[PDB]
Write a protein that binds this ligand. Structure first.
Ligand SMILES: [Mg+2]
Ligand SMILES: [Zn+2]
Ligand SMILES: [Zn+2]
Ligand SMILES: [Zn+2]
Lengths: 49, 259, 46, 52, 67, 428, 98, 505, 115
RNA sequence: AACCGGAGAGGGAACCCACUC
């Protein structure tokens, strides 16, 4: 165990990857949400290019 | 120095709207009648809402707002009611309000449409506008497991307070369809389409100017929201304006005789 | 006294005590929404 | 004061039918925060009725 | 969200026309035909049905907090 | 044609954009390679036998309107406006209140604004479909009259219909959430949620604590106001001193929901969301999709507003003097096209650089529905009833309500709190 | 804890040298409207000092054609420095030249 | 040198044309917060003793009572009936009330006409409301601007603000000996249309307008036309607005220069010489040049000859009576006002084509070494100068043609002629031609190697290839012209931000 | 929080008077009438009826501020005729005019239904 | 048969976003 890396939503390693719209609605997630942001201490962060 | 004699003739009478014409009266009187139609005809709408449970997806004020806009058939009760501010009764009584109840729970797996039919009134006469194939006003949609219960009270008010007490849907008002007084000036009269009430051949664009004319033949089309009959809206408006002027007359007479 | 809460996952109404570690007795979950108040609420329809 | 913090109903005047919470009360009048609107007004004790 | 009860400008009751409007759009009435099939002549009332978006259906897709 | 035919049936043949790239039809070009390429703005209009300009075109553009961004792709007719107005609209589109996400009820977030009745624009560009704007829209198709009515709209202000607002026009709701985390931070010192008692607690505000439950939290559905206890938290005094959280002064809302859990440290944790309905009032900042911002100046009832022959009274009146300095012609064209679309039943198309639509065509279409071909109408004075001598430009336009309300800016002071270093009044 | 700090405060670098590290990266996602959320996820920042009197970097260059939106920039002190991305623009991810 | 201060407020501003230039409307919430300390005296002991009795609950009440000791009794937390009694030495901190003097400013204070005094009037909703003529000094906009208000806390400083910094006392600036306030926005336009020769008012419309004159003696003037029916005139009523016996001579914006030389000098066919004599408007059309902030305007002479009080009433009366007439007249702008006669479109197209051909043949001469450099200039400089000359001439000619095509009823012309908003170039840009986009004075530079965009041939110096926009804002811009126009607007937007850091320093 | 109640536009408080009469000192036989809690609906019809009187030298109305709810009516009459009786005569003629209109309207509506 | 009020704590540093010009 080296550590834990914060992971980006809807990325290939997020739990929401590949889910269908019905599944997302089951998880109280918006299908229209594009993801691409991190969750840290329960707050969204966006890496500005 | 005296009142002129006006005349009325109705060109269309329906359960939905009245269209009529007034002759031999001032522009100000016509405009004031048009004004009282919208603002100062008393009507009944639900104003007090107490929510006992609400598991829907719309918040309590959103449902209470939508409830306020539901028209209620108040044709003869509204005359015999009293304003809640004027009733000597300490709490709600049948002579100053009308009570409504709504208890709907969705249990089956189909989406439940809570509509105006679900509002259970206390009086057999004061009910929603869907009294007598068409659907009914949709309040909210409930998923399985959600419910809402609420108790409401309807009072008498006019448009001046809130738009929910507005009896009329659309008050079309016109006078002088062909520009004879020329209160409006068309830079290019050709481009302007003829009015419904205009009386001109296809060639002529506007009537010739006459300097001696005055506005007469006011055309009205009063379309009801469904709470009051279109024909009784006008009678109530005329009675209300006359009563308003009478109260001012009494207060001025009292003031002068005391002065 | 009883103060029933609603579980966040299975939405079961259940009772949990003062400083008791927040659990749902049926499931491995720890987010608990409160219950709507019992006192009168009155709104204007404006 | 006893009345402060007690839910009250307005039973007289134009505000009739409104519920509220007495924020500050005196022996002559009381400040009532209304439930329906986002405003706190002042109403005499005679129009108030304790509920609950 | 949900269909408004009354037209903002006119005040005509438009809250009961949404389900009928959708039903007529299923039957290859066009919007220009379905709207005046329901008795909406003023463009102020017509824009309500024409431009309304119904998000209440997406909200109902989510499971209720209670049961 | 075969590529378009395959793509048009894409749901059944899974023929996607990647296959189009693999076919050798399209290419990815960056700036370095764009220096040495010969582009064509439109294939039909620039690759033909004519007076030869270039005979060696190398690439062609899919559509010029793709040079815009996300916020700049919601402006109808952006090529009929002065470029600074487009920039102002791009900035102001980020502040228009709408439904920001579908699951906004399960989301405990500070500073959420949602509109009651959002509408998709009557006049739309073709690129709004890919932004899902029609699924999460941010404004209302109102009826605007560009007239100088009573002088309350003069410098960049707007007059509004009070009756329209009474019917839910631009009404919204505002959610604010508060978080509290009781923390065991000392040798004796433990924070704990409870109802503070007047005999036990050391020093507390004048606010009534009766709204709290025995848990130290309010039940959802309880009216709250400024200087009210939201969470009753006390710390033991080595009797006890409270650190209760009060409602933000003048926030003046209704408790929406209360969530209790454990943080990652195992301590109790509470989040409280509070509603407040915001009805538009004078001073609230509104805007159009062309950079025509402005506050509400006054609100007249339906009876007071000018009306057409038909009882149509504009929802918003804006002053004509805003146009000739700003040169937002796109605003006028949108209004005309919006009237056509509301009457026709179609949804107007306002893509930039679309050569198939212009003012003349829209005017001819509008002439068929019994209106003046240039959008002018004859309005009647609301007070006197006499018809206005001039004709008034009127029609449906898409307005946005910005988040800059007036109740969030007004404040005064008269000997309140003082700083600690130099004894001057605080800031903020 | 180091990654969490750098993505929570925005200071890109070691905590011990927080003044030396450039700030402003990893801002709080804007969640006012869907357009605001979409725009915030597609934003380029020039790491040049603000409040500078050199206006050449702030000007709209010809090479922004079809890759950076010309209309969309903040109108405050960061005019022409913070810029949004075109609709069909794609940023290369890189690959081995072997 | 600067510090936070007490007894100050700040909120959004909104217009109100029913206030005087020396009044400001404030919300009750702000008024009920801010207090002023009145010293008790046998004159006001009864008024203050009722005010203290009302308390902090009711708006017209008191918050604190300061005693001779400096002891500060707070009324908002259960005051005893014993210490509500007050003596002649005490001070009572009452709520701000109608007529109080306040200082008002907009935060970018650049000159002394930014911090001026006002009289408080209490109004129902949450915004500061100030009269529209006071907007010009503050540089306010009502587009979301915030302004802040300071309340004088003592009697000495109150009197000093009243006697030195009142608005009506600040009408003329010592910066350029011109008035600072003037008629502006839709009164200016409505005045030009109201005072034209062919404006006639029936009896009822006159009686309504006179109802809005504060300085009227209750004497209906003899109508300019008696018998066919009584008709008044716009000038005949505007004369009643003008105070005292003022005498000045001004020329309208559209006054031809040759009119004075020939006949009809004192009987103007165009109604374009303003002549006010013995406080009565005899002839002419009032425009920005007559009621604006220019030196020698009718308000400037009114302030110089009469007191500031009379000039204050003059401002208020103009706005009220003209705004009430615009209810009848009405004034708008639409898509019909930006359209031309199809004749003018063909003329504009021919002019553009001729100019474009002229640039092409200049390029041909330059390529064949047939262009002789201007003395003192280089071959590149003279080529650039010649091209710019041709394009500027084309734009001016097209603008003049569009101006001539405009009719009398056009609303763009109505706003430009009166000077209320817009200029003569905005009309040409909307209708005829947007023009040439410039970056740093020069044309659009070659930002890709030897060309402006990848859509153009290398070394293309033509008007289209370097930024000339031959379309109007009514006809829309081509995509290349759209991008070039964005490049032009970006330059001005940048300078706005850069300039301030230098000007303020 | 500063929004006035909706019923503020038509309800009289305790102590307020509906109509107040003030004599005008500038010119003879002039008077000013202040009506509380009224709007154009009443001022306009009263003014138009007054303008029909041959013995009325001046009649006008105004609302001092839209946010306030008050009307001011100025009436000047020739010297043989008080403004107060001119005002009451206009009211009592307008009332009669409206009553006649209502009666004719109801008769016409009855005749429209199978007539 | 017999008194029975009552407060005082939130500060600074840094960063970002936005607004009016
Ligand atoms: Mg401004
Ligand atoms: Zn009763
Ligand atoms: Zn569970
Ligand atoms: Zn409508």
């Amino acid at each position: 165990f080296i550590g834990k890396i914060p992971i980006m939503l809807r990325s290939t390693y997020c739990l929401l990857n590949g889910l269908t719209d019905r599944d997302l609605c089951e998880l109280n997630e918006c299908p229209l949400d594009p993801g691409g942001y991190f969750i840290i201490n329960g707050s969204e962060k966006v890496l500005i290019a | 120095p005296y009142a002129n004699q006006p005349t009325v003739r109705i060109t269309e009478l329906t359960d939905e709207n009245v269209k009529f014409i007034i002759e031999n009266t001032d522009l100000a009187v016509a405009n004031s009648i048009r004004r009282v139609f919208i603002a100062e005809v008393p009507i009944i709408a639900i104003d007090w809402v107490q929510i006992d449970a609400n598991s829907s997806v719309l918040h309590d004020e959103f449902i209470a707002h939508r409830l306020g806009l539901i028209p209620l058939i108040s044709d003869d009760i509204v005359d015999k009611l009293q304003y809640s501010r004027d009733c000597t009764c300490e709490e709600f009584c049948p002579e100053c309000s009308v009570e409504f109840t709504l208890d709907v729970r969705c249990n089956e797996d189909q989406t439940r449409h809570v509509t105006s039919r679900d509002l259970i009134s206390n009086s057999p006469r004061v009910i929603p506008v869907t009294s007598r194939e068409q659907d009914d006003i949709l309040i909210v949609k409930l998923r399985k497991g959600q419910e809402l219960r609420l108790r409401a009270y309807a009072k008498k008010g006019f448009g001046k307070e809130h738009a929910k007490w507005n009896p009329t849907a659309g008050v079309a008002f016109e006078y002088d369809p062909d520009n004879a007084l020329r209160h409006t000036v068309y830079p290019k009269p050709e481009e302007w389409p003829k009015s419904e009430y205009s009386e001109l051949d296809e060639d002529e664009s506007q009537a010739p100017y006459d300097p001696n004319g005055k506005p007469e033949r006011f055309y009205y089309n009063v379309e009801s929201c469904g709470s009051l009959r279109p024909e009784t809206i006008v009678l109530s408006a005329l009675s209300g304006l006359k009563k308003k002027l009478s109260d001012l007359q009494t207060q001025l007479s009292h003031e002068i005789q005391s002065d | 006294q009883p103060m029933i809460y609603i579980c966040g996952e299975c939405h079961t109404e259940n009772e949990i005590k003062s400083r008791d570690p927040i659990r749902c007795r049926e499931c491995g979950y720890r987010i608990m929404y409160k219950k709507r108040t019992k006192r009168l609420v009155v709104f204007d329809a404006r | 004061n006893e009345l402060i913090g007690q839910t009250v109903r307005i039973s007289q005047g134009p505000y009739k039918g409104y519920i509220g919470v007495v924020k500050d009360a005196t022996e002559s009048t009381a400040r009532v925060e209304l439930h329906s609107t986002c405003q706190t007004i002042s109403v005499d004790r005679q129009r108030l009725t304790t509920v609950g | 969200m949900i269909i408004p009860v009354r037209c903002f400008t006119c005040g005509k009751i438009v809250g009961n026309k949404w389900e009928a409007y959708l039903g007529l759009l299923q039957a290859e009435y066009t919007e220009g035909d379905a709207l005046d099939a329901l008795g909406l002549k003023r463009y102020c009332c017509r824009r309500m049905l024409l431009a309304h978006v119904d998000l209440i259906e997406k909200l109902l897709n989510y499971a209720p907090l209670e049961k | 044609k075969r590529h378009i035919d395959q793509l048009k049936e894409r749901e059944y043949n899974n023929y996607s954009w990647q296959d189009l790239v693999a076919s050798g039809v399209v290419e990815y070009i960056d700036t370095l390679e764009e220096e040495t390429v010969m582009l064509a703005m439109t294939p039909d209009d620039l690759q033909e036998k004519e007076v030869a300009y270039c005979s060696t075109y190398t690439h062609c553009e899919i559509h010029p309107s793709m040079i815009l961004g996300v916020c700049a792709s919601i402006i109808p007719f952006p090529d009929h406006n002065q470029s600074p107005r487009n920039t102002y609209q791009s900035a102001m589109g980020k502040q228009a209140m709408g439904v920001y996400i579908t699951n906004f009820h399960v989301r405990m977030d500070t500073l959420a604004h949602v509109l009651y009745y959002p509408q998709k624009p009557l006049v739309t560009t073709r690129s709004m479909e890919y932004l899902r704007f029609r699924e999460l829209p941010a404004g209302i198709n109102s009826i605007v009259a560009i007239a100088s009515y009573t002088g309350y709209n003069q410098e960049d202000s707007v007059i509004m219909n009070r009756s329209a607002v009474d019917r839910g026009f631009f009404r919204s709701v505002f959610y604010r959430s508060y978080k509290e985390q009781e923390s065991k931070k000392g040798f004796d010192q433990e924070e704990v949620f409870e109802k503070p008692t007047r005999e036990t607690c050391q020093g507390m505000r004048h606010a009534i604590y009766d709204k709290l439950d025995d848990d130290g939290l309010i039940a959802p559905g309880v009216r709250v106001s400024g200087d009210d206890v939201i969470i009753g938290k006390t710390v033991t005094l080595p009797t006890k001193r409270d650190c209760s959280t009060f409602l933000r002064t003048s926030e003046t809302g209704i408790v929406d929901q209360v969530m209790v859990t454990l943080n990652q440290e195992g301590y109790k944790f509470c989040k409280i969301r509070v509603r407040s309905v915001r009805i538009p009032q004078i001073g609230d900042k509104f805007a159009s999709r062309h950079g025509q911002k402005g506050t509400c100046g006054i609100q007249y009832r339906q009876e007071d507003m000018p009306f057409t022959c038909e009882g149509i009274t504009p929802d918003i009146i804006i002053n004509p003097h805003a146009i000739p300095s700003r040169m937002t012609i796109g605003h006028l064209i949108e209004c005309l096209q919006g009237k056509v679309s509301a009457n026709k039943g179609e949804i107007g198309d306002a893509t930039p650089f679309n050569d198939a639509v212009n003012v003349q065509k829209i005017s001819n279409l509008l002439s068929d529905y019994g209106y003046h071909l240039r959008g002018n109408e004859v309005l009647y004075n609301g007070f006197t009833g006499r018809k206005i001598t001039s004709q008034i430009f009127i029609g449906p336009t898409y307005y946005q309500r910005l988040k800059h309300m007036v109740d969030d800016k007004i404040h005064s002071r008269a000997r309140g709190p003082i700083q600690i270093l130099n004894r001057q009044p605080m800031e903020g | 804890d180091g990654l969490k700090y750098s993505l929570a405060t925005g200071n890109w670098g070691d905590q011990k040298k927080a003044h030396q590290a450039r700030a402003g990266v990893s801002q709080v996602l804007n969640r006012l409207t869907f357009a605001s959320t979409l725009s915030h996820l597609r934003r380029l920042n020039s790491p040049i000092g603000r409040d500078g009197k050199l206006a050449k970097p702030r000007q709209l260059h010809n090479t922004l054609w079809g890759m950076v939106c010309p209309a969309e920039t903040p109108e405050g002190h960061a005019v022409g420095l913070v810029k949004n991305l075109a609709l069909m623009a794609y940023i290369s991810v890189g690959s081995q030249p072997s | 040198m600067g510090k936070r201060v007490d007894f100050s407020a700040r909120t959004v501003i909104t217009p109100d044309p029913n206030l005087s230039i020396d009044q400001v409307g404030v919300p009750r919430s702000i008024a009920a917060n801010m207090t002023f300390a009145e010293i008790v005296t046998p004159f006001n002991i009864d008024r203050l003793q009722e005010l203290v009795r009302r308390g902090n609950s009711q708006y017209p009440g008191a918050k604190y009572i300061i005693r001779d000791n400096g002891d500060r009794i707070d009324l908002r937390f259960h005051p005893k009936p014993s210490d509500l009694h007050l003596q002649t030495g005490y001070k009572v901190e009452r709520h701000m009330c109608d007529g109080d003097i306040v200082i008002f400013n907009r935060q970018p204070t650049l000159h002394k006409m930014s911090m001026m005094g006002h009289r408080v009037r209490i109004l129902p909703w949450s915004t500061f409301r100030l009269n529209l003529s006071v907007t010009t000094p503050y540089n306010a906009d009502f587009d979301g601007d915030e302004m802040n208000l300071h309340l004088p806390q003592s009697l000495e400083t109150r009197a000093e603000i009243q006697e030195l910094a009142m608005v009506p006392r600040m009408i003329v600036t010592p910066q350029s000996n011109r008035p600072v306030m003037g008629i502006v926005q839709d009164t200016l336009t409505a005045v030009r249309k109201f005072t034209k020769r062919d404006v006639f008012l029936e009896r009822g419309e006159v009686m309504n307008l006179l109802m809005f004159l504060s300085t009227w003696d209750g004497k209906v003037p003899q109508p300019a036309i008696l018998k066919p029916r009584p008709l008044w005139t716009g000038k005949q009523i505007f004369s009643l607005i003008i105070p005292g016996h003022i005498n000045c001579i001004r020329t309208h914006s559209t006054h031809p220069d040759d009119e004075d030389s020939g006949p009809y000098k004192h009987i103007s066919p165009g109604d374009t010489k303003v002549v006010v004599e013995n406080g009565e408007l005899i002839m002419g059309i009032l425009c920005k040049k007559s009621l604006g902030t220019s030196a020698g305007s009718l308000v400037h002479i009114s302030y110089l000859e009469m007191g500031h009080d009379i000039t204050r009433l003059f401002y208020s009366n103009i706005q009220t009576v003209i705004n009430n007439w615009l209810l009848i007249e009405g004034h708008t702008i639409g898509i019909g006002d930006s359209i031309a006669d199809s004749k003018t479109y063909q003329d504009i197209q021919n002019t553009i084509k001729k100019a474009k051909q002229d640039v092409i043949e200049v390029i041909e001469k330059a390529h064949n070494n047939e262009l002789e450099p201007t003395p003192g200039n280089t071959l590149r400089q003279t080529f650039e100068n010649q091209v710019n000359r041709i394009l500027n001439d084309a734009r001016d000619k097209t603008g003049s043609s569009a101006q001539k095509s405009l009719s009398e009823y056009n609303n763009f012309k109505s706003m430009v002629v009166s000077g209320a908003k817009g200029s003569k170039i905005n009309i040409s840009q909307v209708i005829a031609v947007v023009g040439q986009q410039n970056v740093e004075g020069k044309r659009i530079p070659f930002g890709f190697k030897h060309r402006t965009l990848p859509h153009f041939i290398k070394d293309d110096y033509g008007p289209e290839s370097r930024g000339f926009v031959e379309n109007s804002y009514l006809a829309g811009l081509t995509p290349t012209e759209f991008f070039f126009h964005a490049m032009g607007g970006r330059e001005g937007l940048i300078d706005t931000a850069v300039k301030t850091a230098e000007t303020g320093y | 929080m500063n929004a006035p109640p909706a019923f503020e536009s038509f309800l009289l408080f305790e102590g307020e008077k509906k109509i107040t009469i003030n004599k005008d000192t500038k010119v003879p036989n002039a008077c000013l009438f202040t009506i509380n809690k009224e709007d154009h609906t009443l001022g306009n019809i009263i003014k138009s009826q007054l303008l029909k009187d041959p013995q009325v030298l001046f009649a006008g109305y105004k609302v001092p501020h839209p946010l306030e709810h008050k009307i001011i009516i100025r009436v000047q009459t020739t010297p043989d005729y008080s403004p107060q009786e001119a005002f009451t005569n206009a009211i009592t003629d307008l009332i009669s005019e409206l009553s006649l209109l209502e009666e004719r309207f109801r008769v016409a509506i009855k005749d429209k239904q199978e007539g």
